[PDB]
Amino acid sequence: TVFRQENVDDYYDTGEELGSGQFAVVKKCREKSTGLQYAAKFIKKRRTKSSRRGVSREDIEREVSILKEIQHPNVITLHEVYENKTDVILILELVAGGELFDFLAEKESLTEEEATEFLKQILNGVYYLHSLQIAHFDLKPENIMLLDRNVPKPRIKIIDFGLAHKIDFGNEFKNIFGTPAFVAPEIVNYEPLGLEADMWSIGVITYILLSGASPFLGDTKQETLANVSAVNYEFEDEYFSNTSALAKDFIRRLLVKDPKKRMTIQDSLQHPWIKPKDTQQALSRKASAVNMEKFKKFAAR
Numbered sequence: 001t002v003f004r005q006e007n008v009d010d011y012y013d014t015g016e017e018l019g020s021g022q023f024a025v026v027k028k029c030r031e032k033s034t035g036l037q038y039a040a041k042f043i044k045k046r047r048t049k050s051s052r053r054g055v056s057r058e059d060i061e062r063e064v065s066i067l068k069e070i071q072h073p074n075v076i077t078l079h080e081v082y083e084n085k086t087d088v089i090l091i092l093e094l095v096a097g098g099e100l101f102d103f104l105a106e107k108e109s110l111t112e113e114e115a116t117e118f119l120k121q122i123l124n125g126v127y128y129l130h131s132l133q134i135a136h137f138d139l140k141p142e143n144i145m146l147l148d149r150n151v152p153k154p155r156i157k158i159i160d161f162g163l164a165h166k167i168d169f170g171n172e173f174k175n176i177f178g179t180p181a182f183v184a185p186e187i188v189n190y191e192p193l194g195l196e197a198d199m200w201s202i203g204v205i206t207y208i209l210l211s212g213a214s215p216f217l218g219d220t221k222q223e224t225l226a227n228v229s230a231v232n233y234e235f236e237d238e239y240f241s242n243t244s245a246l247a248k249d250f251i252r253r254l255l256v257k258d259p260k261k262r263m264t265i266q267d268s269l270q271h272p273w274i275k276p277k278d279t280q281q282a283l284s285r286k287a288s289a290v291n292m293e294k295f296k297k298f299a300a301r
C-alpha cells in the first residue's frame with residue numbers, strides 16, 4: 001500500500017507523549033486544517049528483511065487494514081496514515097481520558113450495576129469486532145481506555161490493534177504473544193487460536209474489576225503460565241464477600257479451558273448478570289459491590 005508520502009509535520013503539530021510500545025511511540029497531535037486532536041502512533045519500520053528491530057511491513061499492514069475496516073463507538077478509528085524512510089505513522093482517534101481502571105479507582109465505591117455499565121461497552125466493542133471475524137488478542141486493562149473522563153457517563157474505547165488478526169477459516173493460527181496473566185490457556189499451550197481467546201481475557205478483566213486480585217498471577221512467569229493452563233483460580237472470601245452469584249457465574253462461563261465450551265460474545269450479552277431477566281436478579285446486581293479497597297491497591301501497581 002501507498003500510504004501518504006507527505007511530511008506529517010506539514011499537517012499536524014505534535015505534542016505530549018501518550019504512551020509507548022516495543023517499536024512504537026504515541027504522541028498527542030493537533031490537525032492544522034481543523035484544530036482537532038488525534039493520537040499519532042509512530043511505528044519503527046524494520047529496515048532489512050534480515051534485521052531484528054522494527055515491525056515488518058506485513059505486521060504494519062495488518063494493523064492498518066483492520067483499523068480501516070472498523071467503525072464503532074467503542075473502538076478507536078484510524079484517521080490517516082503517513083510514511084517516511086524510517087516510520088509508518090498512524091493518526092488514530094485520541095482517547096484522552098486515560099485507563100478505565102484508573103478512573104474507577106478514584107471512586108469511593110462501585111456497585112456491580114455501575115461496573116456492568118462500563119463492562120457492557122467493552123462487550124459491545126468486542127461483539128462488533130467478532131461479528132467481523134476480528135480477534136483483538138491483547139485485551140487487558142491498559143487497552144481499555146476512556147474517551148473523556150470529565151463527562152457524567154464516560155465512553156469506553158478499546159485501543160491497540162497491534163496483535164489483532166482476522167480469523168482465516170481454513171488455516172490454523174498459533175503464536176506466542178500477550179501478557180501471561182491475561183492470555184487464555186490455548187496461548188499458554190501453543191494451540192490453535194480464534195475469537196475465544198478474547199472471551200477468556202474479558203473473564204480475567206471482569207474478575208479483577210470486581211476483586212482487585214489477578215486470578216492466575218504467580219510469583220514467576222512460569223507459575224502464571226501453569227495457573228492459567230490448570231485454570232487454577234478461586235473466589236476467595238476476603239476478595240469476593242460482597243459479589244453476586246450472577247457475577248461469579250458470568251466469570252465461570254468465561255474462565256473455561258476448552259475454547260469450544262467457553263461463552264461466546266453473543267451469549268455474554270444475554271447472560272443475566274448483563275441483562276437481568278427479572279426484578280430480583282436486577283436488585284442483586286444493584287446491591288452487590290466491588291471490593292474497592294483491594295481494587296485501589298491493584299490500580300496503583
Ligand SMILES: Nc1ncnc2c1ncn2[C@@H]1O[C@H](COP(=O)(O)OP(=O)(O)O)[C@@H](O)[C@H]1O
Nearest residue numbers: 018019020021022026039092093094095160162
Ligand atoms: N488512540 C490512543 N489514544 C491515547 N493513547 C493511546 C492511543 N493508542 C495508544 N495509546 C497509548 O500508547 C500505548 C502504546 O500504543 P499501542 O498501540 O499499545 O502500541 P503496541 O501495539 O506496540 O502495544 C498504549 O498502551 C496507550 O498508552
Ligand SMILES: [Mg+2]
Nearest residue numbers: 021138160162
Ligand atoms: Mg500496547
